[PDB]
Amino acid sequence: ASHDKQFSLFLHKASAHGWKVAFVLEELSLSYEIVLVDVAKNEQKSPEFMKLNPNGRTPALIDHGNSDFVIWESNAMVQYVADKYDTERKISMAPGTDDFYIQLQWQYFQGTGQGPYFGQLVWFTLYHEEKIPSAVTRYKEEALRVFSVLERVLSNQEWLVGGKMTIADISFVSWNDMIVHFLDNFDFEKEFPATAAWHYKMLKRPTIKRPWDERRKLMSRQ
Amino acid sequence: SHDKQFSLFLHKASAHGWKVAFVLEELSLSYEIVLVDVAKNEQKSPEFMKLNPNGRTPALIDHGNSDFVIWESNAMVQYVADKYDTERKISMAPGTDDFYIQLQWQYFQGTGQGPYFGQLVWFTLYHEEKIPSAVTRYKEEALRVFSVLERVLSNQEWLVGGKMTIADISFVSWNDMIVHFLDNFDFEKEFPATAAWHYKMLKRPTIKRPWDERRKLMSRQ
Ligand SMILES: N[C@@H](CCC(=O)N[C@@H](CSSC[C@H](NC(=O)CC[C@H](N)C(=O)O)C(=O)NCC(=O)O)C(=O)NCC(=O)O)C(=O)O
Ligand SMILES: N[C@@H](CCC(=O)N[C@@H](CSSC[C@H](NC(=O)CC[C@H](N)C(=O)O)C(=O)NCC(=O)O)C(=O)NCC(=O)O)C(=O)O
Ligand SMILES: [Cl-]
Numbered sequence: 001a002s003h004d005k006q007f008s009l010f011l012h013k014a015s016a017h018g019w020k021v022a023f024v025l026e027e028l029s030l031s032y033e034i035v036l037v038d039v040a041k042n043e044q045k046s047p048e049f050m051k052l053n054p055n056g057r058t059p060a061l062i063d064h065g066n067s068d069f070v071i072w073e074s075n076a077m078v079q080y081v082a083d084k085y086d087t088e089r090k091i092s093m094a095p096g097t098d099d100f101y102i103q104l105q106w107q108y109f110q111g112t113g114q115g116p117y118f119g120q121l122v123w124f125t126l127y128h129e130e131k132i133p134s135a136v137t138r139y140k141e142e143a144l145r146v147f148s149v150l151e152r153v154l155s156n157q158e159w160l161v162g163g164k165m166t167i168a169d170i171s172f173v174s175w176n177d178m179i180v181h182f183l184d185n186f187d188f189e190k191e192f193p194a195t196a197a198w199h200y201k202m203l204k205r206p207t208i209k210r211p212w213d214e215r216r217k218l219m220s221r222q
Numbered sequence: 223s224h225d226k227q228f229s230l231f232l233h234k235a236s237a238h239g240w241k242v243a244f245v246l247e248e249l250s251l252s253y254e255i256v257l258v259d260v261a262k263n264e265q266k267s268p269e270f271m272k273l274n275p276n277g278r279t280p281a282l283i284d285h286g287n288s289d290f291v292i293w294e295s296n297a298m299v300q301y302v303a304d305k306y307d308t309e310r311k312i313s314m315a316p317g318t319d320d321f322y323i324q325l326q327w328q329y330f331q332g333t334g335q336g337p338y339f340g341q342l343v344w345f346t347l348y349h350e351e352k353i354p355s356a357v358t359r360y361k362e363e364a365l366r367v368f369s370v371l372e373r374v375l376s377n378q379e380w381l382v383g384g385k386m387t388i389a390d391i392s393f394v395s396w397n398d399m400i401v402h403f404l405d406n407f408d409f410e411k412e413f414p415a416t417a418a419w420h421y422k423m424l425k426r427p428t429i430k431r432p433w434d435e436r437r438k439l440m441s442r443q
């Protein structure tokens with residue numbers, strides 16, 4: 001509000017979800033200011049943040065270029081910015097097309113399949129009040145299953161939809177980079193070669209590397 | 223093998239396929255239910271994985287659109303509503319701000335209600351080990367989901383656009399299924415606005431009819 005960027009992006013630094021939106025904003029050359037919402041201090045349950053998102057979870061977006069339009073759910077945030085602002089369709093499918101709905105299917109797989117299950121692996125590994133190996137194993141195996149699904153497609157085609165990198169592919173990047181540290185003796189390239197190549201190719205793009213380097217800086221020992 | 227516009231592949235006990243059936247009914251679109259029995263691991267069959275590489279129900283084939291195949295229940299709903307609800311009886315207009323609010327709520331359903339409700343069911347009934355702290359974690363999360371809905375629905379009739387849409391409809395099947403997994407739970411007493419909203423939708427014949435079909439199928443092994 002007291003910055004001149006088109007978007008306010010509210011995120012928690014350790015989360016996969018806000019940075020995903022940042023990747024897309026960078027790709028689309030849209031200006032944004034990050035506003036940190038510190039989940040470690042329970043700031044996501046503050047009245048201020050819950051006015052933005054009644055779910056009380058990060059991230060959320062305010063589009064100051066559209067009369068301060070507020071939207072949450074990281075995948076819906078991505079869809080909103082791509083549909084409205086990716087005029088040249090550099091990284092998104094045209095609305096209405098069959099491909100748009102396949103692009104949507106893949107984002108729902110990311111949001112409902114990758115995200116919550118990766119999140120439960122992290123939860124039972126680090127944050128649950130007791131250590132439960134059967135629960136950790138359940139979600140470790142699920143993470144590997146998710147990689148296998150991606151591999152089954154990406155070993156046969158370059159990108160998830162439309163013959164080029166889109167918001168569907170981009171949406172997996174942050175969680176995929178985060179999760180490898182929670183898997184046993186994990187060699188990404190060895191175990192899922194096509195998925196690894198796809199992941200690392202995206203991560204080399206300066207539009208994606210810059211915010212990801214910023215996350216690393218924010219989380220690093222100051 | 224049938225003359226209906228859609229083949230809807232679902233598992234009878236799942237919340238997700240019936241949600242799609244509700245929307246098909248609302249839009250007077252013809253469909254044939256094709257059961258994929260998860261109890262027999264049919265969701266990992268070669269035939270089904272050709273439809274959905276994730277190997278989870280449901281999936282859709284639109285025989286009115288060159289046998290278009292799509293999976294993820296919320297994406298299936300969006301496709302059907304965007305393409306066929308031209309009068310916008312139960313959906314927001316594509317492109318509009320309200321479309322993205324409608325999308326936000328469907329993602330809350332798909333990423334927030336569904337997976338957490340599903341883990342409650344999992345740790346209650348299906349996990350090899352019985353783990354009280356896991357059951358507690360997801361019971362509390364289910365109640366939290368209701369509290370989010372209540373925060374909104376106590377102040378406005380519908381989630382978006384001043385009308386019942388696919389956003390509201392998407393919560394119905396799971397909200398009926400979950401209450402049997404909660405202790406000492408009186409929906410109306412605990413979350414009065416959410417309860418009234420839910421019960422109103424469940425009463426619609428477009429929703430009750432497929433839900434009664436679910437009951438029928440559930441009753442027979
Ligand atoms: N579908 C939503 C998901 C949004 C989401 O997951 N937001 C997280 C980002 S913080 S990152 C994920 C977060 N981790 C934690 O809460 C651990 C914090 C640790 N104790 C500390 O002190 O830092 C978490 O929610 N773990 C449990 C789980 O995933 O089920 C959040 O706000 N969580 C806070 C809350 O729920 O109150 C979207 O895509 O936008
Ligand atoms: N985001 C997807 C979710 C799709 C989904 O959850 N599909 C389920 C429907 S069956 S219902 C949910 C299912 N239940 C079970 O696996 C127990 C089944 C019992 N024995 C019976 O016979 O009904 C399950 O996946 N429980 C664990 C969890 O939710 O994490 C499925 O195919 N599961 C099979 C699989 O994953 O192999 C969508 O919305 O489309
Ligand atoms: Cl975030």
Ligand SMILES: [Cl-]
Nearest residue numbers: 233236239279
């Ligand atoms: Cl199903």
